Design a protein around this ligand. Structure first.
Ligand SMILES: NC(=O)c1ccc[n+]([C@@H]2O[C@H](COP(=O)([O-])OP(=O)(O)OC[C@H]3O[C@@H](n4cnc5c(N)ncnc54)[C@H](OP(=O)(O)O)[C@@H]3O)[C@@H](O)[C@H]2O)c1
Ligand SMILES: NC(=O)c1cccnc1
Ligand code: NA
Lengths: 230, 230
C-alpha cells in the first residue's frame, strides 16, 4: 500500500526529511509547502527524484488547502497523510503574557487546522492507510516535560485530544491515526543542542508510519516507534 | 479557623453550588462573577450568609483581575482557590468553522487565563492549601470520550497541560493542584437525564478539595474524589 504520500509542510526540517526518506523508499511524494520554489531542499529532491516528487503550493492555515491538494491529486488516493507544519508560539512560552492573537495562531496552527485539513481529505485516504500528525513528547500529561515549553506543549496536548476525539467518531477506524514524537531534532525550532539529525528522525518516523499501515489503530509513538504515555 | 475560599466564576451552575457548599461548612467565601448583581443565586446566598459571602465583580479575561482580587483580599490568605472558568466554545464544535476570535476566546477562557490568574494569586495561597481548576472528563486522553464536544475537550486538555507545566516549575508543591471533573448534571440520555444534582456535585467536589489539603499533590479527580486518567 505505500504509493501516495502527502506531506503537509515539507520545505525544510523534519518535513523535508520525511519527503526525502519516503522518496528513498520508492514512494510517490506530494510535498506541500507555502513557497516550494523558495526551498532549496525541495528543489534538490525534485532534481534527484524527478516526477516522483511533486511540489504542491499550500498553506495549512488556508481553508482552500484541501481543495488545492485534491485538485492536484485528481483521482489519486492518499496512502499516507502526514501533517508536519507547525509553530512554536511565543518565544518566552509564558502563559502570563500570551495575547488573544497569539493564542488563536498557536491553537489554530498546531491543533485545529491539522484536524480541519485531515478531515477534509479523509475521504481520499486509502482504507487501511495512515493519517499521522506530528506531535511532541511535550503533549504528554504523564511525562510532565511541558514545563520546558508550556504553550507549545498545551497546543500539542490539544492536537492529541482532537485526534482522539476524531477517533471517537468512527464505528470502525478506516485508517490509522498516529501522533508522532520525532525526538529533539536539529531544525530551526529544535536548535543546535538537539541530539538527532533530521535524517535519523525521519528514518525512524517512516518506519513507525509503515508499522501502522493496515492496522487501523490510534497510537502515540516516537521516532523509534516506542509508545508514549498520554 | 474560618478558611478563606475564593471561587472564580460563581454566578450560576457548579460555581454557585461550590459557593453554597463552602458557606454551609462555615467558610468565608469570595465569589467572583462578571456581573454578580445580575445573579439571583448569588444574591440569595448573600442574603442568607451575610458577610460570609462576598460577591465580587471580576472577569478572568481582564488584565486587572488578579490585582482587583488582591486589593479586595488585603492580607487575607487564600486557603482554597477554585477557578471555574469555562465556556463550551462554538456550539457546533466544528474545526472547519471555528474562527480566530472564537479560538482565542475558547483557549484564553478555558486554559490560559485560569493559569494566569492562579499564578498571579499563588503567593497569597496558604501553604498546604489547594488550588483547583474545573476541568472535565472530556480532557482525558485515555478515556477519549470527547467526540461529541471536541473543541471543549481540547480546551480542557490544554488546561490540564498548563497545570502540569506549572507543577513542573516547583521543586516541591507548596499547595495542591487539582483538576476537577464535576460530573454530568444533565445528560443526553432521556431515560437517564439527571443522574447527579448540582448540590451533590458541589458537595462531592468540596470533599475532594478538602482531601487534598495538606497533601501538596497534583490530582485529576471527580466529585467522588476518584482519579481520572490523563
Ligand atoms: N524539531 C524538533 O525537535 C521537534 C520536536 C517535537 C516535535 N516537533 C514537531 O515536528 C513538526 C516539524 O518540526 P520542525 O522542527 O521540523 O519544523 P516546525 O518549525 O515545527 O515547522 C516548520 C515547517 O512548517 C512549515 N509551516 C509553518 N507554518 C505553515 C503553514 N501555515 N502552512 C504550511 N506550512 C507551514 C514551514 O514552512 P516555511 O518554510 O514556509 O516556513 C516548515 O516547512 C512540527 O509539528 C513540530 O511541532 C519538532
Ligand atoms: N518534543 C520536544 O522534545 C521538543 C519540541 C519542540 C522543540 N524542541 C523539543
Ligand atoms: Na527547519
Amino acid at each position: 500500500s505505500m504509493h501516495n504520500v502527502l506531506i503537509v509542510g515539507a520545505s525544510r526540517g523534519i518535513g523535508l526529511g520525511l519527503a526525502d526518506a519516503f522518496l528513498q523508499r520508492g514512494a510517490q511524494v506530494f510535498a506541500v509547502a507555502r513557497r516550494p520554489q523558495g526551498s532549496p531542499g525541495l528543489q534538490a529532491l525534485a532534481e534527484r527524484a524527478g516526477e516522483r516528487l511533486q511540489a504542491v503550493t499550500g498553506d495549512l492555515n488556508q481553508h482552500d488547502c484541501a481543495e488545492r491538494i485534491g485538485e492536484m491529486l485528481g483521482e489519486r488516493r492518499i496512502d499516507r497523510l502526514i501533517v508536519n507544519a507547525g509553530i512554536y508560539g511565543p518565544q518566552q512560552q509564558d502563559v502570563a503574557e500570551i495575547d488573544a492573537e497569539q493564542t488563536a495562531q498557536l491553537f489554530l496552527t498546531n491543533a485545529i487546522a491539522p484536524l480541519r485539513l485531515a478531515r477534509a481529505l479523509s475521504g481520499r485516504v486509502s482504507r487501511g492507510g495512515v493519517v499521522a500528525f506530528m506531535s511532541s513528547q511535550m503533549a504528554s500529561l504523564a511525562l510532565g516535560l511541558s514545563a520546558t515549553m508550556p504553550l507549545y506543549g498545551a497546543s500539542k496536548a490539544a492536537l492529541n485530544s482532537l485526534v482522539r476525539s476524531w477517533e471517537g467518531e468512527f464505528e470502525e477506524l478506516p485508517f490509522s491515526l498516529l501522533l508522532l514524537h520525532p525526538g529533539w531534532v536539529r531544525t530551526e525550532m529544535g536548535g543546535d543542542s538537539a541530539p538527532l539529525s533530521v535524517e535519523e528522525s525521519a528514518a525512524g518516523l517512516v518506519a513507525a508510519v509503515e508499522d501502522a499501515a493496515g492496522v487501523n489503530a490510534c497510537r502515540f509513538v516516537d521516532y523509534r516507534n516506542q509508545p508514549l504515555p498520554w
